[model samples]
Target chain A: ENWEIIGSPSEKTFKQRRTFEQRVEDVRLIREQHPTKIPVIIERYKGEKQLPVLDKTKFLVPDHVNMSELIKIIRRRLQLNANQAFFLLVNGHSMVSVSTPISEVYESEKDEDGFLYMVYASQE
Target chain B: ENWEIIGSPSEKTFKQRRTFEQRVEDVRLIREQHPTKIPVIIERYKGEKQLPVLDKTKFLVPDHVNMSELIKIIRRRLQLNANQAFFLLVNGHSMVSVSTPISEVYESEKDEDGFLYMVYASQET
Candidate 1:
């Protein structure tokens, strides 16, 4: 069977959608309001076909949450079964270990604007 | 249906099996011999049951190689089909992104003794 690509609502990334100043300001305000949570922007891979796009892109994840737990939450959001292949890529490049805390990843990978960016994809 | 756990030859990790001095020396020599390759130790998760244990654990992966490419090689090694769910956990905790170069991960996550340790496991499903 042939596979057809399902497109997302906007081709632009979160970084593209908002101005750097706007994003930085947003993060600063969000952080002041919720110091314990990390602001995150999750997007679907432009080339993704199998997995559905997440309904909400922006998130305020707890500092203590690990990648493994975060993945489980994403899996649940997608309604994917355990058998389905799923991956969360940080900064569009590396998959952080499941055991690493979100705070650690946020510290290292957060955008200059201060939001952590993640892209989810299935096997190509 | 009942699921049975298949055990590995040795329960000890590469770190557990070798003395700290010996592991450090091994890595030192390995790096001198292959400056461009990262020394890695891949092991099966102790709780894993669905995936078969790999015959070889030690690897000298090219620095430029990414996690995705490494996973492909491992899947091929295990004779796993594309549909099978597989994960390579770094230092037994995080799954590094497939796009990140091996060298990048090695720099941040490699053990003190110099080898990058990985544990591979399939989903219980």
Candidate 2:
């Protein structure tokens, strides 16, 4: 038995649907790729209230890592003072827990760009 | 010791500063106000590609509750099928985890309107 394509486009060169199994397999393939390296972008919030602006720059995070660990890595990378607490808001929502498992967090929370949005602040 | 007001206002009626302790207490008071209940606006993503829009209507969630339990409550309230998963995005960001706590999240995440924003969807990349 040979594999079959699901739908045929009028163009003859274009195909729309694939075997349901093929689609599932393709999804799994992407999901599997995510675990090896959880891709994300980090952004910082600057300026004062009423005129606050996001930094134009972005930091790329490679590989799977947990939230607590990520904070340490970022703090060290930024060379922030130990007392200079950084409150990170994931996707502009809430400060994610240090214990958050990056795998699930990345899979469901990643944006269309496959980037996770994060905003940092010293205090509320 | 009594706290002396920091600076005298130019006019007799205007007071710009409070004792540092008073300010701290005020902040604590507001922060403490957050625990009793959490207010949030929930929206559903309707339509499909090229026509996606947030449901104009909004859902309000009251009281402090965990994400997992909240999801269940919402699902039951919405009367959705079990397989019909609802992915909740907080503040237009990403789907929040069920494991998240209600307190720290509520205090830090609540908007100025005293509401947390949540959008729901089925799935995506």
Candidate 3:
């Protein structure tokens, strides 16, 4: 029996939902208020079937955190089992190393609007 | 009863075993001969016990290949089941996105001597 593939959110992505100006302004204000935290938007892949969508897409992660730590947080949030094959891809294309600092990833991969974008997925 | 953690290879890592000059020259020559391919060394994690070590540590992957393809090759080589959780970590730390091109990863993460280093491991339970 073939199960239907659960498509991504019907609504537009965070970037698509807002204008570039608004996004930039939002990032600016957030940065001003919490200088030590990075603004990140994590979404499920459009074609993902197994993983559940995150309840909150937006996050204010401390700059000191690393990718491994971030993945752990996401795993706990999703209530994933230890054996689940879960991974986070930055900008929907690149996976940063586990040891890399969030600040470093944000610096290298942040979108023009000043927010870092990430997408999570599990093994097919 | 506690099982022993099968440690990584007792021998030194590729980089540690070879002098910097030798490694640099090796990469320089390999690149000069095969300009389109990237040299890589894949190893098992030092603390890993669930996965077996790969027989061949060295590879000359095409620059255009993506991480996903490389992972598939490793999976086949290891004969891992589809349900098994396996991942390749670059430089013993970072996991690259599956869609990223090998050339891009090499450019950013390659060791000073030129070979891209990777370590593979499975989930810890």
Candidate 4:
């Protein structure tokens, strides 16, 4: 079957009713491109066994770690498609785990180092 | 064999006085329970081969490594006398080798994890 574009929420609609999957898809398509200005939380990722990402208390976050740079580096390191590397954790959290908002995904970036440094999140 | 706390420069003399050993003594006494607030570079040491402490750049510095508490840590880690820990490199640079000026010592406080995670200095840079 072919894919199709979903329509935007209208002025009369709440816009909150989109399915978790649908919203995630929207975020992925937008962030992977530019000009539409999608936030990182809705960005997409590929396949991984969803392990609840671990993390530490308020730790240092480097001023760097842009999507472009991170993707460039990660693609080389994991030898996966850029989209695949991105998707694993966008959908990473399990249904039962703590519901950290999508806004906080960058907080999880710290652990991306072998995922060992996972506990150490970014500084305030 | 004892310290003769001498006088300071007056309006007359060129004030080209005091020995390296003497200034070391003054700063030593300052933080060595020193009161009138001498700098830290002058503290004393018991005589051991000084090792060039290895450290990386801009690690994190936790807030206080108070004189009293640091003494306690050195005591347990090296089993040396309390005096052994007080005086060292303050004369040339930071005693921690991650020294900031005694006034600025707190900044090098980063990289302290093994010394404030050294390379993990700030916000992942």
Pick by DockQ: which candidate is best? 2
Q: Higher-lDDT candidate among 2 and 3?
A: 3
Candidate 2 per-residue lDDT over residues A2-112, each given as its tens digit: 998788655310012345465455445655765465545455554324223344324434545677787787777667778776766675544555566676676656654
RMSD of each: 20.0, 19.1, 20.2, 22.7
Per-residue lDDT tens digits for candidate 2, residues B84-115, read 75666665545444565665566656655454
Query: Could you tell me the lDDT of residue A51 within candidate 2?
Result: 22
Candidate 4 error regions (>4 Å): A1-124, B1-47, B50-61, B82-88, B91-104, B108-125
Measured against the true two-chain complex, the DockQ scores of the candidates, in the order shown, are 0.07, 0.24, 0.07, 0.01
Candidate 4, after superposition: displacement of residue A99 in Å? 51
TM-score of 3: 0.50
lDDT for model 3, on a 0 to 1 scale? 0.82
Q: What's model 1's lDDT at B65? A: 96
Residue-level error in angstroms, candidate 1, position A1: 42
Query: Tens-digit lDDT track for model 3 on A20-46?
Result: 999999999999999999999999988
Pairwise TM-score winner, candidates 2 and 4: 2
True contacts kept of each: 0.11, 0.47, 0.11, 0.00
lDDT of each: 0.83, 0.55, 0.82, 0.30
Q: For every model in order, what is the iRMS? A: 7.0, 3.2, 7.1, 18.8
Q: What is the TM-score of each predicted model, taking all chains together?
A: 0.50, 0.56, 0.50, 0.17
Error of 2 at A10 (Å): 47
